[PDB]
Structure formats: C-alpha cells, structure tokens
C-alpha cells in the first residue's frame, strides 16, 4: 500500500491543475470545506459502523 500511495502522490502532484479543484463561480482554486467535511464524515461513520 505504501508503494501505491507513493505512486499516487507523484501523479496527484504532477497533475495538480484539475478542473475539479476550481471554483465554478470565479475559476479559482477553492475547496467547499463544509461539503467535503460531510462527504469525508459520511465515510468515517460508514467505516466506523462496518468495523
């Protein structure tokens, strides 16, 4: 797993200019943290329940 994460680190580093990361209203790099928190919290609760 460490090797795969290392390879993904190189890719996500070289290809940093993804249209996913740009705010559609101003075309600037931004993150909708309130929504990202909800996404990454849902996974945490789902993974907590499964364990």
């Amino acid at each position: 797993l460490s090797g795969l994460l290392f390879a993904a680190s190189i890719w996500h580093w070289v290809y940093w200019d993804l249209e996913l990361f740009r705010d559609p209203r101003t075309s600037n790099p931004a993150l909708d943290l309130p929504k990202i928190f909800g996404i990454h919290l849902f996974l945490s609760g789902l993974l907590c329940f499964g364990f």
């Binding site: 705010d23 209203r25 600037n28 931004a30």
Partner: protein
C-alpha cells in the same frame, strides 16, 4: 339521490388541521398536498454567497471573503450530473421523488414482512440473520452461498438504481410509465391519473409510518409484525 342525509358536506380543500391555511409554497397541485409543511422544508431556500478568502502568501494583507450577495437558486432542475442531479437539495419536486421512493419501498416492505412471517413463522428481524446463516426462501434452501448473494444484491441494486437515475424529467423521475405502466392505468392527464396518484401517496405514507411501527415495536416488544399483534391480544 341528492344525499346530504348521513354527512355534513364541507367546502374548501381538506388540510391537516381543520382550521389552517396552505403555505404559500404548497399550491395544492401535487397529489397529497394537504398543506403540511410546518417546518417549511419545501419553502424556497434563500442563500448568501461569501467571497473567496484571500489565501495568497505573496500579499501583505489576506482578508476573509465578504457577502458577494444573496441569491435564491431555482429548484427542481435535474441536470446531467450523476452524483447530484437536482439543483437544490431543498426542493418540493426532489422531496416528492424521495417521498415516493421511500414510500414505494415501505409498501413493499410492509407487505413483505407480513408475508414472510405468515409463511416461515420467523420474525422479519430474525429472518435477516436466519437467511444469512442459511440462504433460503419459503423454507427452500437457495443454491447460492451468502457471499455471492451479498455481491449480487449490491450489483443488482446498483445497476437498477443507476438506471433509475438516468431520467432527467422531474415528473418522470416520479412516474416513469412506459414499461412500468404496462396496463396504462395512469399514463394520461385525466382525473383518474390524479386520483390514482392520490391513492399511491396515501398508501405510501401509511406504509412509511406503518413500517416505522414495525421497527419500533421490534425494538421495544422484541417481536415482529404478526408477533406484536399476537402479544397485544394476549396482553389483555
């Protein structure tokens, strides 16, 4: 046969409280519109846009973003976005789709729990573990290990739900018709279609509350649907 002998005819739309008024956002066009939105969930949602915070270290002062302005987005606009088709979460048409989908499952579930308990004698809650330990239907052992069934259920339901999400018409997302209305009972705009849709949501809301009864009764009493019924009768 004028009638008016065994009932008091009442003028006005039947609402959830004898003396109330419909919310401005509930006109009464949709089936089952009984004027019930006390929390105003379907009410048009107002929003304010905050400007992007300055986070450039090449600048002397990095102030926080202010209110670019207020905006009320138009709801009920389905888009090609697979992961979030609707423009707004809080929209009457989207909630209606959720109400029908939540409702149609509960109608199937309420009937299913009753039938399996009358056939196998096992509670609907207890049947979950029993089938997991031994896959079976109607007392017949199924020719499939639970592991394959688990992957199959996820894949089958995954494909089915992805097909359902392909529709872009908000009304057709709630009433697809076509292959799902082979008898052409409510594929028109007649009053029969309106009455049938009124019957569906009523049976749907009943099933949602009823299945909420099943799970709460199983938590408290411990028995299933038929079991709770028998326990109550004997409790006297």
């Amino acid at each position: 046969r004028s009638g008016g002998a065994g009932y008091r005819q009442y003028s006005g739309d039947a609402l959830w409280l004898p003396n109330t008024e419909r919310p401005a956002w509930l006109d009464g066009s949709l089936p089952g519109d009984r004027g019930f939105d006390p929390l105003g969930l379907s009410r048009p949602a107002e929003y304010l846009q905050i400007d992007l915070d300055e986070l450039d270290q090449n600048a002397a002062v990095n102030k926080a973003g202010g209110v670019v302005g207020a905006f009320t987005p138009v709801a009920d606009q389905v888009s090609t976005d697979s992961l979030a088709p609707y423009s707004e979460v809080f929209g009457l048409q989207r909630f209606r789709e959720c109400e029908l989908i939540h409702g149609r499952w509960a109608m199937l579930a309420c009937l299913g729990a009753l039938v399996q308990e009358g056939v196998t004698g096992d509670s609907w809650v207890a049947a979950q573990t029993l089938v997991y330990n031994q896959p079976q239907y109607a007392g017949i052992d199924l020719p499939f290990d639970i592991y394959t069934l688990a992957v199959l259920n996820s894949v089958l339901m995954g494909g089915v739900e992805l097909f359902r999400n392909s529709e872009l018409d908000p009304e057709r997302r709630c009433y697809p018709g076509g292959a799902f209305d082979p008898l052409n009972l409510a594929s028109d705009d007649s009053e029969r279609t309106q009455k049938l849709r009124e019957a569906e949501i009523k049976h749907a809301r009943l099933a949602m509350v009823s299945f909420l009864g099943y799970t709460v009764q199983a938590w408290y009493t411990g028995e299933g649907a038929l079991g709770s019924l028998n326990k109550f009768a004997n409790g006297f």
